[PDB]
Amino acid sequence: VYADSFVIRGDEVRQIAPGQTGNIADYNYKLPDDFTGCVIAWNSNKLDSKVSGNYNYLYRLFRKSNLKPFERDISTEIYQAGNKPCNGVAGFNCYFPL
Amino acid sequence: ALTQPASVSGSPGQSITVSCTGTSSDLGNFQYVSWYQHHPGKAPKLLIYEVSKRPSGVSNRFSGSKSGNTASLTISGLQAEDEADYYCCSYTTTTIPVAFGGGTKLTVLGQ
Amino acid sequence: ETKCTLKSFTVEKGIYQTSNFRVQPTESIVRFPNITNLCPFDEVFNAT
Ligand SMILES: *[C@@H]1O[C@H](CO)[C@@H](O)[C@H](O)[C@H]1NC(C)=O
Structure with a gap:
């Protein structure tokens, strides 16, 4: 096991399911189409919530x-938009992916 | 029948998803629905055949999936020339045997 | 029973044979081993 x-973040616990996509089902954890096992979920506002974000x-x-x-995506690197010559620092069409 | 939103817009780069749907009585079991792209002044080209099968010559950023009665496609890593006229074509048994979308016109906010 | 096992309404003298004497049980007893090495689901739901 x-x-x-x-x-x-809120409403995309519903999207955690074997087969459809979403906001965090393409760049983050996604379930396969042959997902054995299931989802254990609960509303824990008591621990992972504090007042100013x-x-x-x-x-x-x-x-x-x-x-x-x-798969796990752990490489942090500055992301350019297609063909713009842009590296090292942020700015136009260069945002951190986090 | 077959219907889709008339237009859609969003931020450049990412965050776009286009869907089609239709009445299940007119729709003959919902197989062999395809996704095309039309350019102004250029010939249209095939992008996706039968929901989630990738033909040769296309990029991996295009993807498609169908749930229940609604089919849809997503594309990640948008560019300055990725504005399109994405159409869904399908089989309808009661009316005219082929149905061709509802019109789409993607626009960007880069300028 | 000694009539129905011979398909006759009259039976002669002598010792016959019938069904066996069966003693039935009452309840069920299941004793698998004491629980041990509980899996650590308690620490992951109570994790900080
Ligand atoms: C957490 O520990 C308590 C005992 O302190 C226990 O009763 C409870 O079942 C555990 N699980 C939870 C609520 O995360």
Whole structure:
């Protein structure tokens, strides 16, 4: 058996399901089409919530392409938009992916 | 029948998803629905055949999936020339045997 | 029973044979081993 640990932003706990995509189902954890086992979920507002926003948790907004299931994306690198010569620092069409 | 939103817009780079749907009585079991792209002044080309099968010559950023009665496509890593006229074509048994979308015109906010 | 096992309404003298004497049980007893090495699901739901 295997188990994980997440903090999901609100309404996309519904999208955690074997087969359809979403905001965090392409650049983050996605379930395969042959997903045995299931989802153990509960409303834990008691622990992972504090008053002026929790900036200790991170999520990926974009990639080069879609990632395969059961993969971890740990490489942090500045992302350019297609063909713009842009590296080292941020600015126009160069945003951090976190 | 077959319908889709008339237009869609969003931020450049990412965050776009286009869908089609239709009445299940007119729709003959929902097989062999294809996704095309039309350019102004250029010939249209095939992008996706039968929901989630990738032909040769296309990039991996195009993807398509169908749930229930609604089919859709997503594309990641948008560019300055990725504005399109994405159409869905399908089989309709009661009316005219082929149905061709509802019109799309993607626009960007880069300028 | 000694009539129905011979398909006759009259039976002669002598010792016959019938069905066996069966004693049936009452309840069920299941004793698998004491629980041990509980899996650490308690620490992952109570994780900080
Ligand atoms: C956490 O530990 C408590 C005992 O302190 C236990 O009763 C409870 O079942 C555990 N699980 C939870 C709520 O995470």
